[PDB]
Write a protein that binds this ligand. Structure first.
Ligand code: BBI
Ligand code: CA
Lengths: 555, 672
């Protein structure tokens, strides 16, 4: 225990990262398929489990800390799974190794404290969650009473069991909604449902799920239009438009109001210590340095013309010409337009190089690298000259032509740097880089964990349709990561939920219990997304106004 | 004469008459038929349009006669363009300016419009940066996917040189159902061919609508003029991920955060804290301006015992359990249930109906009908049970009271202390700001009328975005479509469906031969501007509501809260069936003993703290049993905090007359 201070924790962190990457490089094949990489990764997991149980046994010679309890639980679960596989559902218990990246936060107090703060911020939101649950229950009950067993009549064919539409919609339940118009089509009962039976109000679970989906703003108009086909136009619109207004718009305001108040409540708590004073003290000496540096050197160590307003307007017109040259490319552009583009590129590169050389011989080399603007300009000009010499040299560089244009596109910063009014926000966000990185890393870890869990659950199980290929799947790690990101954005998450439900048996059987994966990924994913991208916009932005007010006091 | 019509203009009813006229004229404008120019309804509304123009011209002349700014120019502009009437489509579209001149006739509407303009002006630094970054990302996307989004109708020809002629298509993937189709070298609707197309595509991505489709179209982007390849470059998704993270997640949350910060700063534009602070501006005010509550302890012990049976915690718990069971049974109804299940559920419904109809009369007997309407929640159960006893007869119109009986859950389950207060304060804030909602409604009305005039003639097809359920044919349907776009469902698909090359419905008036004319290039501007304006106005309403309750949202209950005042009022009403203003002093000992330690006195015996502090603290020198409601509260709030020594007690009253609002000749007794 004497020697385990520095290296043991580092070794365990490295082992956790290696286990995470080994899980990342695993490919879940459909129908028990595999390859050589999976065979090697099985032995890799064996070795990792051996290391983990050795560490768990050693650490005892424990349970009070929650993280140690989690480590013990996952270790004994891995031992259980290995023993069952060796002495034998079998691979269904394999999903508990996705918690290995979770314990990495334990080793990262930074991430941990941030995690503790985010978790503690959820206490005021429990009342809003209860209100949302009650509204969902009430609306589900109302849907059960009103729209029960009505999405089961689609335009069929004459004396056959073939649906007459490629994208079927319900008929009129009692002659009030939509009727078949084709000459040889009639509609009767026996239909499955609009979304394969997932979306309907003929059960409490179904009604609750569709009410939640409608509240989340995703696909509620589809349910409203299916109601409009089943029944008339007057009753369904009251149910759904009111549900949209109360279910989310009112709730979104309530959720934001509490968090904005809670975040502002942290502003008054942190002001007592004086965190803003440190930022003001650091900022108040920056303007005292620029005026005391040029004057302390220019007396003894030509430059009036380069700082004239004419030079400023000339460089502005030059950057405007560069922007126009870049933003004039389009598909099937004329060849002469291309010729003007290369001519302008060469001419403006020569002019900018000449301007830089003139500035370097009249302002000073050392004063450049002090400010971040000059070094970036040096990088841009070197990239541009490298691009030109590579293009006109013996190297074709097919793909690099487009990349190098984005390098020279960044000249607009040379004219956006003279704002001095918006620079307070830029300075604050550049000074809070450690916190920004901490929240971004926590969000990335959450995304990685849920991507691995989705890979374990729906990996290779999206091959049920047999008539098409699906793009938002959990086949490999990049695709699962993209799917998790898309669900986090909230767009078409219900489609992925429907695919996941149909991958486990559809509306029938216990395959619908897996829908709580997407409910948790949405509610607990948007909650973190709304605490990581709003903290930066409420903390470093309120300080900027306070910094502006303090600066105005001296001005 | 000049001073003759001035009295008529400045009358208390002429302005309201003209406001009613303009509102009803706008309503008439919102009732035309976009489809048929020649119709009975249009002619009837056409006769109406003459009447208002006559009235409005009369209003302009007399108003000018006595007055012989740019608001008056708008007043004449709306009337002026109408007189030119009676290309015509442009004028008809422009006549939508009718309700825009109601802003000048209302102080609140003008104030909220100026507030919106001020909020717009301060924002512009963020808009410029976001627009610049989006333009740079559009340029990068142009460099990346220039012309690479083309594809053939059949996924077998990978270049336009062989994507010609006819091909055999297999419907739904079945090999036994082939059909001949033409193959066309098509392009994506949202491509990166030029800078403007890239900007539009990135805007649609930033709205989080159809962005996975663009992502998977760009992943398959192979080359300049060749077809897609399945999962060619998955690594190109980094562009979309970075763009989304930078713009929508980051720089759009800075937008709302800075709006919130600006509203908070606006909420601190007054300095009324001469000596006190904000914490003393939410409790001392309540203590100074308040009202005793009513408990209504009855008489006639034959009724008093029944009331005590009714008014008890176990009875309330039993009603809670009964309603929970009733809803649990309500939620068990499913599709195609067994006959025994349906009969049992009906029988249990009758049982619960009987229980509730018994409990209403049981409460009325021990509570008297006159006082039944005194409590808001008590009347809620009053109007439900008769609905329950009606549907039990109509079971063997019908669904009205069947639906309305579910409200008992929220009625008897909102009796909390953190959710009920939240709902009440947010509803109060919404009622306190009814003009931002008016702005949103005006925007919806204007855009719905414009959409009816522009895209109203597009035929509804069952395989398009403009279908029987989504169209611009009638005002309610246009408003529903605009609500759908505001929620952001498929607004880009609707914009594509509103493009110029669209079929026209037969009922419209068009020359024979030109069936495909309806639809305009104005759709892009219409939809993008509507989305931006609606988003801005929605967040403006949200931040206004949030700033209206900033005191509650930063209550910091760890030091004080109005719940202490509510508990004090309830304890005051415990021994007082009615207010009666004043009470005796013998029960004041128990009143002080029945307060929480944060508000009253500590857990220790009152023989040391409360007994000494009662005489030590200044009290009105009234009789031994005459103490009023407006004095003990102030004395207790002074004891808990803001303690001042004897003799200098008038300093607090001077501060009250200098900081606190109008005393209404009520603090004369409170001074002593
Ligand atoms: C009053 C008319 C101007 C409104 C306006 O101008 C802008 C210029 C640049 C960037 C944003 C705006 C803007 C908005 O108000 C605006 C735009 C969008 I797009 C937007 O996001 C809509 C969807 N959202 C979640 C799905 C993505 C972040 C929001 I909130 C506000
Ligand atoms: Ca959507």
């Amino acid at each position: 225990s004497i020697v385990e201070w520095k290296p043991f924790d580092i070794f365990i962190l490295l082992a956790i990262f290696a286990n995470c990457v080994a899980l990342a490089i695993y490919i879940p094949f459909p129908e028990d398929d595999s390859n050589s990489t999976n065979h090697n990764l099985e032995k890799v997991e064996y070795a990792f489990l051996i290391i983990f149980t050795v560490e768990t046994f050693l650490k005892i010679i424990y349970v009070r800390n929650g993280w140690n309890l989690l480590d013990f639980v996952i270790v004994i679960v891995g031992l259980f799974s290995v023993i069952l596989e060796q002495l034998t559902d079998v691979k269904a218990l394999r999903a508990f190794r996705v918690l290995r990246p979770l314990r990495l936060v334990s080793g990262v107090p930074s991430l941990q404290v941030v995690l503790n703060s985010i978790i503690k911020a959820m206490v005021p939101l429990l009342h809003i969650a209860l209100l949302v649950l009650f509204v969902i229950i009430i609306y589900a009950i109302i849907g059960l009473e009103l729209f029960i067993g009505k999405m089961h009549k689609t335009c069929f064919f004459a004396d056959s069991d073939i649906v007459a539409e490629e994208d079927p919609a319900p008929c009129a339940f009692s002659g009030n909604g939509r009727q078949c118009t084709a000459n040889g089509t009639e509609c009767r009962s026996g239909w499955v449902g609009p979304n394969g039976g997932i979306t309907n109000f003929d059960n409490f679970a179904f009604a609750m799920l569709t009410v939640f989906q409608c509240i989340t703003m995703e696909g509620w108009t589809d349910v409203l239009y299916w109601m409009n086909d089943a029944m008339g136009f007057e009753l369904p619109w009251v149910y759904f438009v009111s549900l949209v207004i109360f279910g989310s718009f009112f709730v979104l305001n309530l959720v934001l109001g509490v968090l904005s108040g809670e975040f502002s409540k942290e502003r008054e708590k942190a002001k007592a210590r004086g965190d803003f004073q440190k930022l003001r003290e650091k900022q108040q000496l920056e303007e005292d340095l620029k005026g005391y540096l040029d004057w302390i050197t220019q007396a003894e160590d030509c430059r009036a013309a380069v700082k004239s307003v004419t030079f400023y307007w000339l460089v502005i017109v030059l950057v405007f010409l560069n922007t126009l040259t870049i933003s004039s490319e389009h598909y099937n552009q004329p060849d002469w337009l291309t010729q003007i583009q290369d001519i302008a590129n060469k001419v403006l590169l020569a002019l900018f190089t000449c301007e830089m050389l003139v500035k370097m011989y009249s302002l000073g080399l050392q004063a450049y690298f002090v400010s971040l603007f000059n070094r970036f300009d040096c990088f841009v000009v070197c990239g541009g000259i490298t691009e030109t010499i590579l293009v006109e040299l013996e190297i074709m560089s097919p793909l690099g032509i487009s990349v190098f244009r984005c390098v020279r596109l960044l000249r607009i910063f040379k004219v956006t740097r003279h704002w001095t009014s918006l620079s307070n926000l830029v300075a604050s966000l550049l000074n809070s880089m450690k916190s920004i990185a901490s929240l971004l890393l926590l969000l990335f870890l959450f995304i990685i964990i849920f991507s691995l869990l989705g890979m374990q659950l729906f990996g290779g199980k999206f091959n049920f349709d047999e008539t098409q290929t699906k793009r938002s799947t959990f086949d490999n790690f990049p695709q699962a990561l993209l799917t998790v990101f898309q669900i986090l954005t909230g767009e078409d998450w219900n489609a992925v939920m429907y695919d996941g439900i149909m991958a486990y048996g559809g509306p029938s059987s216990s395959g619908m219990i897996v829908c709580i994966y997407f409910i948790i990924l949405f509610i607990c994913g948007n909650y973190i997304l709304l605490n990581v991208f709003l903290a930066i916009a409420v903390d470093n932005l309120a300080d900027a106004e306070s910094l502006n007010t303090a600066q105005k006091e001296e001005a | 004469i000049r001073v003759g019509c001035h009295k008529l203009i400045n009358h208390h009813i002429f302005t309201n008459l003209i406001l009613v006229f303009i509102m009803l004229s706008s309503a008439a404008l919102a009732a035309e038929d976009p489809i048929r120019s020649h119709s009975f309804r249009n002619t009837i509304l056409g006769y109406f349009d003459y009447a208002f123009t006559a009235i409005f011209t009369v209003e302009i002349l007399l108003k000018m006669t006595t007055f012989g700014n740019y608001f008056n120019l708008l007043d004449m502009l709306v009337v002026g363009v109408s007189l030119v009437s009676f290309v015509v489509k442009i004028l008809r579209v422009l006549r939508v300016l009718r309700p825009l001149r109601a802003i000048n006739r209302a102080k609140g509407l003008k104030h909220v419009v100026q507030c919106v303009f001020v909020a717009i002006r301060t924002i512009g630094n963020i808009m410029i940066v976001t627009t610049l970054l989006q333009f740079m990302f559009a340029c990068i996307g142009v460099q990346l996917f220039k012309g690479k989004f083309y594809r053939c109708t059949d996924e077998a020809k990978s270049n336009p040189e062989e994507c010609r002629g006819l091909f055999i298509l297999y419907k739904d993937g079945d090999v036994d159902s082939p059909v001949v189709r033409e193959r066309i070298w098509q392009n994506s609707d949202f491509n990166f061919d030029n800078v403007l197309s890239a900007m539009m595509a990135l805007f649609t991505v930033s709205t989080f609508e159809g962005w996975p489709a663009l992502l998977y179209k760009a992943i398959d982007s192979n080359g300049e003029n060749i077809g897609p390849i399945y999962n060619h470059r998955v690594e190109i998704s980094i562009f979309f991920i970075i763009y989304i993270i930078i713009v929508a997640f980051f720089m759009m949350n800075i937008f709302v955060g800075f709006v919130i910060v600006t509203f908070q700063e606006q909420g601190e534009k007054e300095y009324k804290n001469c000596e006190l602070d904000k914490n003393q501006r939410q409790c001392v005010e309540y203590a100074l301006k308040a009202r005793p509550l009513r408990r209504y302890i009855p008489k006639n012990p034959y009724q008093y015992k029944f009331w005590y049976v009714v008014n008890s915690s176990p009875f309330e718990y039993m009603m809670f359990v009964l309603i929970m069971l009733n809803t649990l049974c309500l939620a068990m109804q499913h599709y195609e249930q067994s006959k025994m299940f349906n009969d049992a559920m009906d029988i249990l419904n009758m049982v619960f109906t009987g229980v509730f109809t018994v409990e209403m009369v049981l409460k009325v007997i021990a509570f008297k009908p006159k006082g039944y309407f005194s409590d808001a929640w008590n009347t809620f159960d009053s109007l439900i049970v008769i609905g329950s006893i009606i549907d039990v007869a109509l079971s063997e119109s019908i669904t009205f009271f069947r639906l309305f009986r579910v409200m008992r859950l929220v009625k008897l389950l909102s009796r909390g202390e953190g959710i009920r207060t939240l709902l009440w304060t947010f509803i109060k804030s919404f009622q306190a700001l009814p003009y931002v909602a008016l702005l949103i409604a005006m925007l919806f009305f204007i855009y719905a009328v414009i959409g009816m005039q522009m895209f109203g003639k597009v035929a509804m097809r069952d395989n398009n975005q403009i279908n029987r359920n989504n169209n611009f044919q009638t005002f309610p349907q246009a408003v529903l479509l605009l609500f759908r776009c505001a929620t952001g469902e498929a607004w880009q698909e609707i914009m594509l469906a509103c493009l110029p090359g669209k079929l026209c419905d037969p009922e419209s008036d068009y020359n024979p031969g030109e069936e495909y004319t309806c639809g305009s290039n104005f759709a892009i501007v219409y939809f993008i501007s509507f989305y931006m304006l609606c988003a801005f106005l929605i967040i403006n309403l949200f931040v206004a509501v949030i700033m209206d309750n900033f005191d509650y949202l930063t209550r910091d209950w760890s030091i004080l809260g109005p719940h202490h005042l509510d508990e004090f009022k309830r304890i005051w009403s415990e021994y007082d069936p009615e207010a009666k203003g004043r009470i005796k002093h013998l029960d004041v000992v128990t009143l002080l003993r029945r307060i929480q330690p944060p508000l009253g006195f500590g857990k220790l015996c009152p023989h040391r703290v409360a007994c000494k502090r009662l005489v030590a603290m200044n009290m009105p020198l009234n009789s031994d049993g005459t103490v009023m409601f407006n004095a003990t509260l102030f004395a207790l709030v002074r004891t808990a905090l803001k303690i001042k020594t004897e003799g200098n007690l008038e300093q607090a009253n001077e501060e009250l007359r200098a900081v606190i609002k109008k005393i209404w000749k009520k603090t004369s007794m409170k001074l002593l």
